[PDB]
Structure formats: structure tokens, C-alpha cells
Amino acid sequence: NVSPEARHPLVAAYPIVHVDMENIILSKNEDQSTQNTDSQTRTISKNTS
Amino acid sequence: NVSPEARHPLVAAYPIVHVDMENIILSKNEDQSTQNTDSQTRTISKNTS
Amino acid sequence: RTWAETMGLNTADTARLNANIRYVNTGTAPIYNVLPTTSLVLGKNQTLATIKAKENQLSQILAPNNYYPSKNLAPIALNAQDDFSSTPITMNYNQFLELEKTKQLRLDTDQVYGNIATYNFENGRVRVDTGSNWSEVLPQIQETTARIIFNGKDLNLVERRIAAVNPSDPLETTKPDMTLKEALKIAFGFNEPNGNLQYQGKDITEFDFNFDQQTSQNIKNQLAELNATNIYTVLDKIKLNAKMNILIRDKRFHYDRNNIAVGADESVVKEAHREVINSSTEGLLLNIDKDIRKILSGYIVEIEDTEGLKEVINDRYDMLNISSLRQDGKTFIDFKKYNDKLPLYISNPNYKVNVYAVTKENTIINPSENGDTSTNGIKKILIFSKKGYEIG
Amino acid sequence: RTWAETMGLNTADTARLNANIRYVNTGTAPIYNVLPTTSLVLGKNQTLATIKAKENQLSQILAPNNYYPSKNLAPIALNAQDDFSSTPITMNYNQFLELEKTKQLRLDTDQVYGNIATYNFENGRVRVDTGSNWSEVLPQIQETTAR
């Protein structure tokens, strides 16, 4: 895999690596919830006056 | 990489490393929560007197 | 009947991250088992996190001029900080409002780990030695060699290193003598077909030479002793030394801080824009040269009446990308893909057509203040002027 | 219709820390696989933590008169205490209140790990030996040499 111009003795054969970013995907860590409720009251009110 | 001052037998070649801090980032570990409720009541009061 | 709704948060872990990255090797020899160290920087120099690449993001082989993964494949994700890839990369609340406001986040490359594969004389194979990395070798190449950067192939910078002699190290004074002519003839592929140093077609005097502070000091000492003024005649007598930087660019264009070709001159824009292949309301399949076509922005048409005025159809900052590319070498400068899929407005065949273009030292990258959303403060060059009976 | 709001805390884990650091070699010989032990001091001599640098904060080469990372690059982050970098450096409520007022925080450098690279006489190459560090060599120099 050494490129053909580096097979002279006086030319150095060495890699040059660098990383480049293409997308940044940030995800908001946030928790959420809903709730329902159905109350049913039956009263028996007695009065004695 | 041994610098040319120390390519002499009578000069020692040794590293002097120290670390310096250029920023401090402190993050208050605190959790916040909000809540909204809606509620409707249908009371049908009856009395026999 | 009661309804509710809740939301929660935390002001130290309010977001996560995921970085799609790709590796490039623009060097001269392959690097095996690649693990780069890399850093996510918010704003100017506020670093969120430094991540050495984990096991999921290891590149087993990276040949020169290759990518990991391939160019047809989607990039790899970096979403871990733990050594076992169990912990995400988070943000507090102040680093999250600043990122949704300004949208500024870059990714540096501090270093690269990777191994070296050496020939086995026993069975003729090639075996990766996992005890030897490339970091023992690159600080020895960089101190005993001269460096030459040259951009005469597709206007991209190619860096090569050549073993030259250091006169203050007794092991280094054994290497053979390196002259500046011979260093070009073996690294990039120059020649001399008529006794003059040449690239593929270009004479060596079509380029210019820029050194660093230390190198240019040493070149002037070599030119005083040779009784020479022009460097282009004593190219076979300039001795190279260790730690020399030399930059060789094409003379015809303009260069920015990163030495990229980003602007041209007023004469070169009419040399490869002379002949026209076809002429109609829709077709500009032209022989635009590969030098200027990467440094221009787009094209601009101009309506010209009988008495003479300035009318522009594409008089807007974003209506200038009318550059389509076919598979025949002629870059298809279409006219109608920004015109509502309707043919262009031509009211009289006596009216001629004029087409122009802008480089990138006159192309702006943001909308202006009040009403300059158009070609007001954009200077161009006259390119096209023929009568409207040969185009139609 | 009801609006509610809730703000919690924990008074031994109130804040975290993320120190941006950078290494400097003002010496004479290069050091490989640099891993400094370093302590974050609050106030005069009250130490919150001591962190030997983990694998994210490892400098492969540090030549003389060099930096890691170089001056055109942003510094590296040090935000872990666990050996596998999965536990953040923290502080309690009294340390967090005093840090907002006086803003006195500094960074000592207690010691530095790092290997040596020797010439191999067979094939001329230079190979880092991962068995010996500079802490064997450096006390031998300070007892025989004049500074």
C-alpha cells in the first residue's frame, strides 16, 4: 500500500490522518408524563333540626 | 528530539513537564420540574325537606 | 374529570451528543488499527469532552487517499466516553442554550494512534506489530527531512518529505547530497524534456516559491555565493537541509490563509471561457477549466436592450447556484431551475445575451444589512458578449 | 387550573467539575505516554480531588518546547475520577458556595508518568520500552549534576 513515489530511499513514507465531523446529533434528556383522574362522590346528608 | 544542547556527554537530557489550567467549568447538579392540571366538577345537589 | 401534565429536567445532564465522523489518510503509507483522540469544542475554546476512540470506532486499515468508512457509506457515530461504551457525552444547561443559539461546535484532532506493518523475510508475509505505533517514527521523520508542499495536481495540496543533510549531527552527514531540482524530480514527478524543468506541460517558472523565516534566511546565503539573482536558473545547485519548509504554488491564482485557491485574476477568466459549444435558452455546456471552476461561485446572466441597460434575471444572493454537472466534462450551467420551471423571459430576438461569473474573493457568505440581497456590491468580469441571433 | 414548580438538590453532589488543561515540556528530552497526577485545590490548601490522567487525557509524544494539544487547538477536558472514566468529579454544597464567592481554584502537579525511547542497534529504529519510566532516571540526575 506504500505509494509508488515513496519507494525511493530518500523519500519518506508516512501517514497523515485527520478526522472531520459531518453531523452533530444532540438529544435533549427530558422526561415528561400525563395523567387522568375520574372521581365519583355519592353523599347521603341527613339533617335533624 | 534530544535537543542539540544535550548531544554532549556532560549535559543531561531530561524532560520538565507541568500542567496549567486554562478554564474551569462547573455545572450545578439541580433538577427542575413543572406541572399543569385541569379539572372540572359537575355537582348535582338534591335535597328533600 | 381531572387532566394533568408534567415535565422534568436536570441542569447538569440536559442533553446528549452524537458525532458522525469520517477518517481521511492523505499521506504516503497505511496506518493500521487507527484510534484518534478528538475533542468537542463549544464556542471559541470551551471544550465539552475529549474522547479517545473506543472499540466500535476502530479502523483496521487506512490506505493512503482512502476513507473510513467508504465515500458511498454513511459515517460512524461517536457517542461514548466510558472505556466500555456505556456512558454518553452530556451537556449542562448553559452549554445547551449556547448551542441552540449560535450553532457553533467543532471537532479537533489532537493525535492519532495506529500500528506499523513490516515485511517478514521468512514467509514473505506482512504482519502488524502491535507494540510499535507510528508515534515513534513521525518525530524522527520530521527532524531529519525537508518538506515541500505543491498544488499542481487538481489544485490540492500534496505534502512530501525528502531526506536532507543536517550539518550538526554526525549520523546525518552520511546521506547523499540533495539539490532542489532533484528533490522535485523524485517526489512529484517533474522532468526536463528540452533542458528545462517541467511538470506535465508547465515550465517551472509558472510557479512561485515561498519559504518560512528560517528557510528563507538560508536560501539567501546560497544565492549570494552563487552570484545569482533569479532562483529559477540555479535550481540544480541549491542544497537542501534538514528542517526546511518550501511552498510551491501556481502563480496564476489567489490564496487565502490556508493556501487554498480561492480567487483568480482578470486575465485568466477569459482564456478558458472563449469558445462556446452550444447556444440556446437553456444550454451552457462549456469548456470551463478545472482550475477556476472550483474557485468560482456561479454564473450571472444579463439582459441587454437595444439602447443599452443593465437587467439581471438572477439578481439575488441565492439565485447564483445554477451549476449542474453532466458526465462529459462540460459543466451544465442551466437557466430554468430557479425560474419556476418556466422558460426565460425573452421579448425580442434583437436583444442579445451576456453571461458573467464571480470568484470567491468577491463572494459574500451572509446577507447584508438593509436591501443588498442582490448583486449590488458584487463586482464581476465581462465574459460573454455576442449578438442574439447566434444563440436564440 | 394549577401551576406547579419544583427544584430539587442533593447537598453532597451539588456541582460537577470539568477542568480544561494543557501540558508543557520546557525540558531537554521527549517523554512518551504522558499521564500527570494532578489535584484540584480549593481555597488555600483544601483539596477536592486527585486525578491521575485517564486514557482520554494521554499525550503520546511531548517533544521539548512543545504543547499538548498545540496552541492552535483547544485544551483537553478532565472530567472523570473512575479508572474507566464513568464517574464525574464533584463537590458538596459548602465547596460550591465558597467557589462562587472567592473563585479561588488552582491545579497542582504532583508527579508525571511517562516512558523512554531508546535506539535499537539492529535496525536503527527507536522503540519506546513500556517497562521503564522517567521516575527511575530523574532522581539519578538530581544527585550527580549541578543545576
UniProtKB/Swiss-Prot annotation, chains A, B:
Give the recorded effect for residue 15 to A: Reduced toxicity in combination with lethal factor. Decreased membrane insertion and translocation of LF
Residues represented out of the complete protein? 275 to 323 of 764
Compositional bias (Polar residues): 32-49
Region (Disordered) location: 28-49
Domain comment quoted from the record = To pass through this hydrophobic restriction, substrate proteins LF and EF need to be unfolded prior to translocation. The alpha-clamp consists in an amphipathic cleft between two adjacent PA protomers, which assists the unfolding of substrate proteins LF and EF. The alpha-clamp binds non-specifically to alpha-helices of substrate proteins LF and EF.
- What's the impact of mutating residue 21 to I? In strain: PAI
Q: Where in the cell is it found?
A: Host cell membrane; Host endosome membrane
This chain belongs to the protein called: Protective antigen PA-63
Reading the lineage from the top rank, the first entry is: Bacteria
Task: Summarize subunit and interaction data from the UniProt record for this chain.
Answer: Homooligomer; homooligomerizes to form homoheptamers (PA-63(7)) or homooctamers (PA-63(8)). PA-63(7) or PA-63(8) form ring-shaped oligomers that are in a pre-pore conformation, which do not penetrate the host membrane. PA-63(8) displays an enhanced stability, suggesting that this form circulates in the blood to reach and exert toxicity even in distant tissues. Interacts with lethal factor (LF) and edema factor (EF); can bind LF and EF simultaneously and interaction takes place following homooligomerization on the host cell membrane.
Q: What is its membrane topology?
A: Multi-pass membrane protein
Function noted in UniProt: Mature form that oligomerizes and forms a pore to translocate the enzymatic toxin components edema factor (EF) and lethal factor (LF) into the host cytosol. Following attachment to host cell receptors and cleavage by FURIN, homooligomerizes to form ring-shaped oligomers that are in a pre-pore conformation, and associates with EF and LF. Toxin-leaded complexes are then endocytosed in a clathrin-dependent process, followed by a conformational change of oligomerized PA-63 from the pre-pore to pore state, which is triggered by the low pH in the endosome.
